[PDB]
Amino acid sequence: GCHVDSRVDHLFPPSLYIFVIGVGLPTNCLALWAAYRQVQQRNELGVYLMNLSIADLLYICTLPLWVDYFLHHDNWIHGPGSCKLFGFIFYTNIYISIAFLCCISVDRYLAVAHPLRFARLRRVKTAVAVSSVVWATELGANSAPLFHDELFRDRYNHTFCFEKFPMEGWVAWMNLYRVFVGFLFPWALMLLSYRGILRAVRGSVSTERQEKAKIKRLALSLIAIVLVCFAPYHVLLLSRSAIYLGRPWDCGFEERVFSAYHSSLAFTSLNCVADPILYCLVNEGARSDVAKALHNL
């Protein structure tokens, strides 16, 4: 028993998702190939980039069903079953991607800020082990929606998928975990790792001032894109959880920010477009590899 009249919940999310699919699929495939090249050269950073590309590819694969759901004004009719699987993928790959971004940041921090050390933690085998642990933890930690009902039809025409208004207590605590452990904690680790990388780079003499400025701009760009993409949705999620725990029966806030909520959820999908650009297509080596792969293709 809550409204929704996101009058722009049928124009912005579907068009943005169409653009995301169309641009990400080639860029993400090329990024996956470049990460495969990096793994071939015994570089562990290719493992984390490869896993990030895999997660983004799964997100883009599940996206068109959400485009059809949004085009029917929040009506998902595929089944009880595809709702659960595809919504789980859709709502979990954001956190898998942020976990692997934090893994990339910490790996770069170990390589740059602490060279000549931690060579054991800088192998492909340990990268694969860390990736497996990250995957298992993220799927296990985000497994609560799999064990509950995934599809709810309200009094009105539209039927939701993984959402419900008013929301539930268990999903409230789940959202608190996602905001504070799923997103805020890995983002804090990314910020600390890139701050350490910047300090170490400023402590170096081989790199010129222009290269240091370029590195600082790239790191700030990574942090800022992650925050801009993932901040509105998580802030609205935390707000919804806070008012639901505070007074459940006063859904005047659910109707007040329903359109902004779905708009922010759609905006979060731009991270799987930014990642191939920010991790493969901005540096010369990966762009050259992608180039060799396309000309040979």
UniProtKB/Swiss-Prot annotation:
Disulfide bonds join C2-C251, C83-C161. Glycans are attached at N157. It is a multi-pass membrane protein. The chain crosses the membrane at residues 2-38, 43-73, 79-114, 123-149, 166-203, 208-243, 254-282. Residues 150-165 are annotated as: Extracellular loop 2 (ECL2). The record marks H148, H158, H262 as: Proton sensing. GO terms for molecular function: G protein-coupled receptor activity. GO terms for biological process: adenylate cyclase-activating G protein-coupled receptor signaling pathway; angiogenesis involved in wound healing; G protein-coupled receptor signaling pathway; glomerular mesangial cell development; negative regulation of angiogenesis; phospholipase C-activating G protein-coupled receptor signaling pathway; positive regulation of inflammatory response; positive regulation of Rho protein signal transduction. Keywords: Cell membrane, Disulfide bond, G-protein coupled receptor, Glycoprotein, Membrane, Receptor, Transducer, Transmembrane, Transmembrane helix. The record marks E138 as: Required for activation. The keyword Calcium does not apply. Changing H72Y: Displays smaller cAMP, rho, PLC responses to mildly alkaline to acidic pH of 7.1 but almost the same or higher responses to severely acidic pH values of 6.5-6.2. It is found in: Cell membrane. Proton-sensing G-protein coupled receptor activated by extracellular pH, which is required to monitor pH changes and generate adaptive reactions. Activated by an optimal pH of 6.8-7.2. Ligand binding causes a conformation change that triggers signaling via guanine nucleotide-binding proteins (G proteins) and modulates the activity of downstream effectors, such as adenylate cyclase. GPR4 is mainly coupled to G(s) G proteins and mediates activation of adenylate cyclase activity. May also couple with G(q) and G(12)/G(13) G proteins. A multitude of proton-sensing residues, which include extracellular histidine residues (His-148, His-158 and His-262) or triad of buried acidic residues (Asp-56, Glu-138 and Asp-275), contribute to activation of the G-protein coupled receptor activity and pH sensitivity. This is G-prodeshotein coupled receptor 4. It comes from Homo sapiens.
